[PDB]
Write a protein that binds this DNA or RNA. Structure first.
Lengths: 141, 141, 63, 107, 67, 145, 206, 65
RNA sequence: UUAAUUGCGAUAACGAACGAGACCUUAACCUACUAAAUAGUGGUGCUAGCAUUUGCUGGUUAUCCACUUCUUAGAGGGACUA
RNA sequence: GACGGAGCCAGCGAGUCUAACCUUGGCCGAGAGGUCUUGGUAAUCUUGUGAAACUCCGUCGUGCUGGGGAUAGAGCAUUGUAAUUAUUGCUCUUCAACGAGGAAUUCCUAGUAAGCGCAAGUCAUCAGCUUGCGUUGAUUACGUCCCUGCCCUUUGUACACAC
């Protein structure tokens, strides 16, 4: 019947889509990776320095899919976190915009998203091709 | 045409709106099925109203639920509250109350909060104390 | 076994400097003719069951 | 020329509920006696205006912050009528304490 | 506690002899008739007088009450 | 799964730039014990050396250990972006450097005598032993300062 | 049982719970009872429940916490650190793991073991202070059943609390070990030994 | 209570005499029964109408026309 | 007896008043009244996509219609210890 | 518990044309920030304030440790004419005491304390403060006057500036 990405686990979808992205090898990893802590308030780039960008790509894909259109700022706010400001109480700080912009600019060429003339980045038909297909595959894995 | 009733549930600030119509048994929360409700330790808690009276009646009824506001567990109770309310509403409008009263009896006998919203609500906070009740630490000399 | 079973038949009232102890009349389970005033700490109701180590020490410090 | 329609919208701002709905009811009943089709008077969210300040002119004593909270109430009403009678509805149905703004719209 | 003030007791007293046969054991109807037979500024106070006079109506029904 | 079945070739407590570094702890965090090298300057050198991240300090071979030392000495040569360094764009010779264990304390004295030679306010605070960053000295600084 | 087929796929491990209510779909309330007189119908187990998180109202009336299912109160008692205020769902995660542990420990339903532990670690009698002068005295009398069960659960969770501090030991297995020892009787657990000690102090300072 | 706003009006004045300043705080309650705004009865006040009761009639009849 | 000089009741006291209370505001109830592109919802309604026995989405009063249960806020009703 | 990845749900606000306010989106930028434009005088644009605890998965594995961020060093930015006696934030370098606390003492009985975050006053920049808002959300008791105070009756008094 119909199997789109809402009946499948979100975390498993992101993991499996990252694995699919890694095998397919069309992610144009920007290269400067593993120097950005992925959060301006964090203290280190991820532990999975070899697949975390692909995880970010899959997560952003699902995020843009589930929303109408999302801009870089709403990428930063969601992908930020509580910075341990030291001897002061925690405050949420917006993450690095570089990873958000580069992952979106990456999805522009594969075709997952487009510039969304109304707003920021919105899902595309090409993205709908692969995402729901990955959901279907992972369902009957 | 299509017989549809609408209900809602409410925790402190999480508000759930549900549509109960005669159908096949599609249970969703913001587009995700009842089996992917977050978190896993609380998924069976929203499952509760389904199992309290057996899935045979839900084989004829499909409920669409959208939740806005509040917190995660507040939703987790809000959807189940709304499901019990929508079930009793549909089986009042269209099905005999000989079954409907048994439904309401079972729900409130299991827990009274399934179809009655707990009026436990926050009260304002008063100057001189972080919480509504407690005051600041006192000094003497 | 030095254990005695008794059941509340009457709650009398609260004593103690802090009011944290209550006088209660209690009749045994193993027989229904031995009833004694005793004292209890926490919240209490009627017909509650009490396990007495020594079922002889009558209540002291009544009011 | 043939009774041109305007799609006019009127905003009514006030703090006092009694006077705000006084002028609102005046306007609505004038429209009704004109036998007019429109959208009902939409009541805006209760705009509470919350500000907190010390009660002590000095700093001595128990700390007494206490708040002066306002209740701005607004209603906007859609109307479809000629200029000749919207000018009547703006020259009348007014009182102190309420401010009414009339704006042409395509809504 | 919920102890009733002298105002509500006074009002219920003055109410009962003046309109005893019309008063009844039913709080709902009594609360309604409190509109015609008297004016109470707040619905809450009107409910208070009604609630007291219902109990007095019942108590008079079972035995005379001095006062 | 890195289920290891090795021989008795494990190398215990070791010296890198004459600093004691344990062999049992993971390399990335154990290497912060060399003075002047912190958590991130220790992670990035490992990933740029492409050495195994999920391995202890006694399983990495000598050649990659020496190349890690080489990278630590030469941050200008391994794509380190010059904002990731300690001595960003120094004062005397203007070059971009990184200070190491045998020299972190040397530069810690060095900036000190230059400040107390120019008789700067921060330098004289360093001399007296107070704070330098303009904090509140009235309530704190009693148990060790 | 010929389970029903629904347009929403519901797993058979949920479908099978339709027959009888099963705590976490693994632990049953049948063949489980409070073996301790004076604590029956106070260590409330008869009524059914599936998870130990309920949005109840038990601080409203004097004895309305008595009917609350014991698993909820115990899990709530795991919520006790000063940093662990809130995190009731973390507490229910911990109880899930520890119940799984106890089932493997005893060839028996874990809730029977926890009921035994509560009953055996609820101190029967203790003392209250009497005498406002310099020579105060401890006067010891028996304890109400609800006070007993509250002390029992508090002491169980406190033994787990002390053991979990500054050690590699997982809280789930710590709590399971403490509960099973409190039930069977070993005096190698903190709760049973403190129950013994408090009752003994009452026995001596009569 | 709000009857302070409903029925009291207050007014404070500073009066400068040769020696200093005198404070004058005039607090006035208007008659609630008067004026044509808001309530005319205090929240506590209870008003009872005259029942105008009549003598019972013991002759049932009909007025036909 | 009450949180209460809150009341019952005893009375050389009676009847009163202010404070408390009463008052008002906030919060929860109302599938009931009133509505609404600055709130939402239903339409194998408009269009298009997805996966294909049909479920999920994007522009939908400005691409329409019907409504106010969720939202809002007026009038009220509701508990007064029944 | 920390770290990293992912899931990811509010309310109470506020905001510039009597002007440089709130800024979406795109771009530069590790970050900090800069940038062109958009929308908003405001239930509409910030904004579904996608906030954090929480959840899942993995690393650490009893080591004052990867907890902790104190002091200090170097650089990059914004506001202000002006950041020096560090404004603040950001980058990296350092991980000090602190293994839960003696007398003593504070606050607190249900959406409660406490954990968690956000908004707003402050404001050119500065929030460890504070008012509010919410998110998660206990235990224990429904009492007593023993301690501390307050009040009442009686009592005593040589006090009334009132012990």
């Amino acid at each position: 019947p119909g199997v789109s990405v809402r009946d499948v686990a979100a975390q498993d979808f992101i993991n499996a889509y990252a694995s699919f992205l890694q095998r397919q090898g069309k992610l144009e990893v920007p290269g400067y990776v593993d120097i950005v802590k992925t959060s301006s308030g964090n203290e280190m780039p991820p532990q999975d320095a070899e697949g975390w960008f692909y995880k970010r790509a899959a997560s952003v894909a699902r995020h843009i899919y589930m929303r109408k259109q999302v801009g870089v700022g709403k990428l930063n706010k969601l992908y930020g976190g509580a910075k341990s400001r030291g001897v002061r109480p925690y405050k949420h700080i917006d993450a690095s915009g570089s990873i958000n912009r580069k992952v979106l600019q990456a999805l522009e060429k594969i075709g997952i998203v487009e510039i969304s003339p109304k707003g920021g980045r919105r899902i595309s038909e090409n993205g709908q091709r692969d995402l729901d297909r990955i959901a279907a595959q992972t369902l009957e894995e | 045409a299509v017989p549809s009733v609408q209900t809602f549930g409410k925790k402190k600030s999480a508000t759930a709106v549900a549509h109960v119509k005669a159908g096949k048994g599609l249970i969703k929360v913001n587009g995700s099925p009842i089996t992917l409700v977050e978190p896993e330790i609380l998924r069976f808690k929203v499952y509760e109203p389904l199992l309290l009276v057996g899935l045979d009646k839900f084989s004829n009824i499909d409920i669409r639920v959208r939740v806005t506001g509040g917190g995660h567990v507040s939703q987790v109770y809000a959807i189940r509250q709304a499901i019990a309310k929508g079930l009793v509403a549909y089986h009042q409008k269209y099905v005999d109350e000989q079954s409907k009263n048994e439904l309401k009896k079972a729900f409130t006998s299991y827990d009274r909060t399934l179809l009655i919203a707990d009026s436990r609500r926050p009260e304002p906070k008063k100057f001189g104390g972080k919480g509504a009740r407690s005051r600041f630490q006192k000094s003497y000399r | 076994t030095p254990v005695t079973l008794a059941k509340v038949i009457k709650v009398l009232g609260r004593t103690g400097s802090r009011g944290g102890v209550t006088q209660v009349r209690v009749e045994f389970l193993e027989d229904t003719s031995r009833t004694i005033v005793r004292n209890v700490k926490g919240p209490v109701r009627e017909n509650d069951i009490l396990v007495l180590m020594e079922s002889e020490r009558e209540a002291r410090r009544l009011r | 020329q043939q009774q041109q329609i305007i799609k006019i919208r009127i905003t009514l701002t006030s703090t006092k509920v009694k006077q705000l709905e006084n002028v609102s009811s005046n306007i609505v009943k004038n429209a009704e006696q004109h036998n007019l089709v429109k959208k009902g008077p939409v009541r805006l969210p209760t705009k509470v205006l919350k500000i907190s300040t010390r009660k002590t002119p000095n700093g001595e004593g128990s700390k007494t912050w206490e708040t002066y909270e306002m209740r701005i109430h607004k209603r906007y009403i859609d109307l479809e009528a000629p200029v000749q009678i919207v000018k009547r509805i703006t020259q009348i149905t007014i009182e102190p304490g309420v401010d009414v703004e009339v704006v042409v719209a395509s809504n | 506690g919920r102890v009733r003030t002298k105002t509500v007791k006074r009002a219920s007293k003055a109410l009962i002899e003046r309109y005893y046969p019309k008063l009844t054991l039913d709080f709902q109807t009594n609360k309604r008739l409190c509109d015609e037979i008297a004016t109470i500024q707040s619905k809450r106070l009107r409910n208070k007088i009604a609630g007291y006079t219902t109990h007095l109506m019942k108590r008079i029904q079972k035995g005379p009450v001095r006062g | 799964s890195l289920v290891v079945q090795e021989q008795g070739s494990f190398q215990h407590i070791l010296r890198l730039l004459n600093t004691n570094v344990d062999g049992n702890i993971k390399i990335v965090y154990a290497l912060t014990t060399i003075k002047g090298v912190g958590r991130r300057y220790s992670n990035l050198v490992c990933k740029k050396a492409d050495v195994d991240l999920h391995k202890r300090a006694g399983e990495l071979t000598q050649e990659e250990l020496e190349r890690i030392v080489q990278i630590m000495q030469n941050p200008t040569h391994y794509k380190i972006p010059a904002w990731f360094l300690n001595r960003q764009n120094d004062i005397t010779d203007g070059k971009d450097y990184h200070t190491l264990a045998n020299n972190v304390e040397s530069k810690l004295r060095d900036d000190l005598e230059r400040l107390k030679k120019i008789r700067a306010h921060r330098g004289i605070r360093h001399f007296w032993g107070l704070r330098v960053r303009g904090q509140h000295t009235k309530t704190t600084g009693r148990r060790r300062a | 049982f010929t389970p029903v087929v629904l347009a929403t796929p519901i797993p058979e491990e949920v479908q099978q719970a339709q027959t009888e209510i099963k705590l976490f779909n693994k632990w049953s309330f049948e063949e489980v009872e409070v073996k301790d007189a004076s604590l029956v119908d106070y260590v409330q187990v008869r009524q059914p429940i599936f998870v130990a998180h309920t949005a109840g109202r038990y601080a409203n009336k004097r004895f309305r916490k008595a009917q609350c299912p014991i698993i909820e109160r115990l899990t709530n008692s795991l919520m006790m650190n000063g940093r662990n205020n809130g995190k009731k769902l973390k507490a229910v995660r911990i109880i899930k793991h520890t119940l799984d542990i106890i089932n493997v420990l005893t060839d028996q339903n874990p809730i029977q073991v926890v009921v035994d532990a509560i009953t055996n670690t609820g101190p029967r009698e203790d003392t209250t202070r009497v005498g406002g002068g310099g020579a105060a005295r401890r006067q010891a009398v028996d304890v109400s059943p609800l006070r007993r069960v509250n002390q029992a659960i508090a002491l169980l969770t406190i033994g787990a609390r002390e053991a979990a501090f500054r050690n590699i030991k997982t809280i789930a297995e710590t709590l399971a070990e403490e509960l099973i020892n409190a039930a069977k009787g070993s005096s190698t657990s903190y709760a049973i030994k403190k129950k013994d000690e408090l009752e003994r102090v009452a026995k001596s300072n009569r | 209570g709000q009857p302070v706003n409903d029925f009291i009006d207050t007014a404070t004045r500073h009066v400068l005499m040769r020696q200093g300043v005198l404070g004058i705080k005039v607090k006035i309650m208007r008659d609630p029964a008067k004026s044509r705004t808001g309530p005319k009865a205090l929240p506590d006040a209870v008003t009872i109408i005259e029942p105008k009761e009549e003598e019972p009639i013991l002759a049932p009849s009909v007025k036909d026309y």
